[PDB]
């Protein structure tokens, strides 16, 4: 596994069935919320190549150490989607493990090779 | 991992232990009502081989982003099947998250190697 | 990745930090019910070496196809159990995934190097 | 994938898209109430750096084999944690699958290197 540099490459790795690995770095990204400084890295075991236009996966991720309620059981699923043009968002929607109720959501936007990096 | 062109590259590949990528492209395969041309990668961490003449996989994947319900929680359940004739299916369920009741399903048929394809 | 010959191998590899998979040939394995000629391969994401006697590990599979109730949203899951012997067992037991009920249970037994085979 | 020796390596291969796998060692490990002598290895697909001083990633567990409760459904949550001192610890939420209950909790803290070990 290496860094997917292009869109192009990530395409390429996609259709010759490589595991694709997100790292996306948050003070590189833009929010709507303050996000502290940190790297989050990913590996969804399903991605999707949408008109070679979009790159898509997603992560529905549990936690007991979500802001929005510490200690309870959450999910944060987020939604990854790369255009071709290398604009990067992360769409993150918080959800009550048991009962599915959304608590909340944020959203950040990065670019390709800068906030957000693909290997594969 | 390789591109696994053959039904018995594919058992054997199973038989010693690889752990196995399924990539479609749907525009290359056969369906009910028409789906927007996309590439499709799933890697399942289980496999089967079924006597020496079929190979059987599934996937149980959370959306909120599925058509049939935009925004609600969703299970996309696949259940990938492969003959030894190289005639390939997916049936995907969707299914609500927290109730578990059907929402629909459709299938898609298609051809190891042209629209199906396998790595490992 | 490799075959993991013998029980040593495999405590080794998993102390080593690799990914463990393991290939159930069902003919070669001996249960109360008939099971279908199959081979199953399964690499669970977690491992753990009792004493230094007892390899565990487990699967949550969700499916659809489940004999004791087709159709219907259920859980197999299956514990891998491997002793220093050589000897390993899977117990599988089957739950409805909304309710968690037991549906049912199943225990295969195997040799390692034999029915059993380890990867990794 | 290699041994992981000190905090940086760690770091450096996360912000590499490298896939993290880790090992315990629970009796060099220290816990409120004593553990029995077992490895425990996990790999989970995600993980994050806080600052560039902590390490964090966790796993939700489902088992029928939890002491607190055999043969109920539980999911034993592990929230992973390593420090750029190396010192790690381990902190398990025991959840009843069904209700989300909290059924309970311990913890082991550890050593980078000697009780917790790092590979990747």
Redo the contacts between chains.
């Keep these: 596994?290496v860094?997917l540099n292009t869109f192009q490459n990530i395409?390429d790795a996609?259709?010759?069935?490589?595991?694709?690995?997100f790292?996306i770095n948050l003070k590189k990204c833009t929010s709507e919320m303050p996000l502290?400084?940190?790297?989050?890295?990913?590996?969804?075991?399903?991605?999707?190549?949408?008109?070679?236009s979009r790159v898509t996966a997603?992560?529905?991720?549990?936690?007991?150490?979500d802001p929005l309620a510490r200690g309870t059981?959450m999910?944060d699923?987020s939604?990854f989607n790369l255009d071709s043009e290398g604009d990067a968002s992360i769409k993150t929607?918080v959800?009550n493990?048991?009962?599915?109720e959304r608590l909340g959501s944020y959203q950040m936007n990065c670019k390709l090779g800068d906030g957000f990096?693909?290997?594969g």
């Design positions: 596994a860094e395409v996609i259709a010759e069935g490589k595991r694709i690995t790292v502290n400084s940190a790297i989050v890295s990913v590996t969804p075991n399903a991605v999707m190549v949408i008109g070679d997603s992560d529905r991720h549990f936690t007991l150490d059981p999910f699923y939604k929607t959800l493990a048991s009962s599915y990096k693909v290997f």
